[PDB]
Structures are given as structure tokens and as C-alpha cells.
Design a protein around this motif. Structure first.
Motif, PDB file in Angstrom:
ATOM      1  N   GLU A  33      52.284 -56.493  28.819  1.00 52.58           N
ATOM      2  CA  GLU A  33      51.089 -55.543  29.928  1.00 52.58           C
ATOM      3  C   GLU A  33      50.340 -55.992  30.626  1.00 52.58           C
ATOM      4  N   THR A  34      49.257 -56.770  29.355  1.00 53.01           N
ATOM      5  CA  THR A  34      47.088 -57.108  29.416  1.00 53.01           C
ATOM      6  C   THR A  34      47.374 -57.857  29.651  1.00 53.01           C
ATOM      7  N   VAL A  35      48.160 -59.167  30.109  1.00 51.55           N
ATOM      8  CA  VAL A  35      47.923 -60.560  29.769  1.00 51.55           C
ATOM      9  C   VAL A  35      48.518 -61.093  31.043  1.00 51.55           C
ATOM     10  N   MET A  36      47.671 -62.221  31.415  1.00 48.98           N
ATOM     11  CA  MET A  36      48.630 -63.198  32.947  1.00 48.98           C
ATOM     12  C   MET A  36      49.305 -63.595  32.151  1.00 48.98           C
ATOM     13  N   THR A  54      43.121 -67.413  35.716  1.00 51.50           N
ATOM     14  CA  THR A  54      42.858 -66.796  34.725  1.00 51.50           C
ATOM     15  C   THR A  54      43.394 -66.252  33.540  1.00 51.50           C
ATOM     16  N   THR A  56      46.116 -65.996  30.578  1.00 51.59           N
ATOM     17  CA  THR A  56      45.632 -65.782  29.086  1.00 51.59           C
ATOM     18  C   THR A  56      46.571 -66.534  28.346  1.00 51.59           C
TER      19      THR A  56
ATOM     20  N   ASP B  66      38.735 -57.818  33.276  1.00 50.59           N
ATOM     21  CA  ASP B  66      40.293 -58.287  33.169  1.00 50.59           C
ATOM     22  C   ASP B  66      40.803 -59.311  33.637  1.00 50.59           C
ATOM     23  N   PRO B  67      41.652 -59.650  32.867  1.00 49.76           N
ATOM     24  CA  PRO B  67      42.178 -60.929  33.172  1.00 49.76           C
ATOM     25  C   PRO B  67      43.307 -61.117  33.571  1.00 49.76           C
ATOM     26  N   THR B  68      43.788 -59.796  33.658  1.00 50.10           N
ATOM     27  CA  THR B  68      44.864 -59.529  34.824  1.00 50.10           C
ATOM     28  C   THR B  68      44.573 -58.826  36.507  1.00 50.10           C
ATOM     29  N   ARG B  71      40.927 -61.710  41.828  1.00 49.43           N
ATOM     30  CA  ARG B  71      39.303 -62.163  42.746  1.00 49.43           C
ATOM     31  C   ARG B  71      39.155 -62.633  43.582  1.00 49.43           C
TER      32      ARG B  71
END
Ligand SMILES: [Zn+2]
Ligand SMILES: [Zn+2]
Lengths: 60, 116
Positions: A33-36, A54, A56, B66-68, B71
Motif C-alpha cells: 500500500e505504500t509503494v508506486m 516516481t 518504486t 511520499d513516493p505515492t 506532484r
């Protein structure tokens, strides 16, 4: 990595090598849930309208 | 305005208000100790029915890394004037009816936040 892996079976090369090299990574359901995440490496990164730029990780 | 709890000085417990009937003033007494102190706010309780809370006070400067998080470059910062900046909704439950964004500068040592 692809060249070294394609010559597997013959020598000794396996998935543990990829994990140790720092190319793949185990992300569990809670951390996903905290990664693109990205679907494909080529299509979603070239240069277009600025979506996130961005990423990841990337799915296989 | 709001009202803060002010602990006792000896026993360090809650101080309840007391209207001095003699000197006709507002005091804060202790149930356990007998400490007294003269009030200055002249207020005891306030209720915000509309709950008009400033979402900017909850937003932190760490949201930038914050990577997600999206921007944009069309909303530059004010103080430093950096171009890159993030934007997102209230991200808080109970949202009455508003998706107004809260732009945050994405640059170190700035942590600025604004809204348009
Ligand atoms: Zn006390
Ligand atoms: Zn700034």
C-alpha cells in the motif's frame, strides 16, 4: 542479469542470486500500500504527461 | 479560542473551576490538594458544532517525501519558490463536503503548506 540467468541449469545460477543481487524484493500485502507499483517497465516510464514519475517497483 | 487543562502544582492533578462567591472571581481548585490560582482566560468550555478545523494544522512537512503522492509544477512554493510541489485531499474522515486540495512544497528545509 538476464544473460547470467539464461545460462542457468548448466552452471549453477538461480533465483537466490537475483534476490541477493538487489534486483527483486519481497513486498507483502501490508507494505504494497505504500509503494508506486508499475505494470510494465517500458510502457509506463518513457516520457509522457507527468503522471507520477516516481515509480518504486514494477511487476514481473 | 479554546481552553487548556492546567495541572496542579503539588499533586499534579486536574484543576476544576470554582467561582469564588466571596471575592466574585474565577478560581481553579484541586479535589485532592487545596491549591488555588487566579484565572486569566475567563472561559471553561467551548463547543464547535460546525467543527471548523483547519486541515493545514494537521498536515506535516514529511508528506513531501511520499513516493505515492501526486506532484505538480504549476503551483510553486511561496517562501522558497520551488517549482515541484505535492497536492492531496483532506485525507480525513467526516469530510463534510469538500475535495479542496492542500498543496505542500516538496523541498528540504521548507515544509511550507498552502491552499488555492
Ligand atoms: Zn492539586
Ligand atoms: Zn517551499
Amino acid at each position: 542479469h538476464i544473460d547470467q540467468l539464461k545460462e542457468r541449469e548448466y552452471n549453477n545460477y538461480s533465483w537466490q542470486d537475483l534476490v541477493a543481487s538487489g534486483v527483486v524484493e519481497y513486498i507483502d500485502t501490508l507494505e504494497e500500500e505504500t509503494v508506486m507499483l508499475a505494470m510494465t517497465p517500458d510502457d509506463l516510464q518513457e516520457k509522457e504527461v507527468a503522471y507520477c514519475s516516481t515509480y518504486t517497483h514494477c511487476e514481473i | 479560542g479554546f481552553v487548556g487543562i492546567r495541572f496542579c502544582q503539588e499533586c499534579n492533578n486536574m484543576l476544576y473551576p470554582k467561582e469564588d462567591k466571596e471575592n466574585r472571581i474565577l478560581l481553579y481548585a484541586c479535589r485532592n490538594c487545596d491549591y488555588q490560582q487566579e484565572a486569566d482566560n475567563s472561559c471553561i468550555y467551548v463547543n464547535k458544532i460546525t467543527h471548523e478545523v483547519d486541515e493545514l494544522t494537521q498536515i506535516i512537512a514529511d508528506v513531501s517525501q511520499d513516493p505515492t503522492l501526486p506532484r505538480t509544477e504549476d503551483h510553486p512554493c511561496q517562501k522558497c519558490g520551488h517549482k515541484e510541489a505535492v497536492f492531496f485531499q483532506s485525507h480525513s474522515a467526516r469530510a463534510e463536503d469538500a475535495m479542496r486540495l492542500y498543496y505542500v512544497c516538496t523541498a528540504p528545509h521548507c515544509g511550507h503548506r498552502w491552499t488555492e
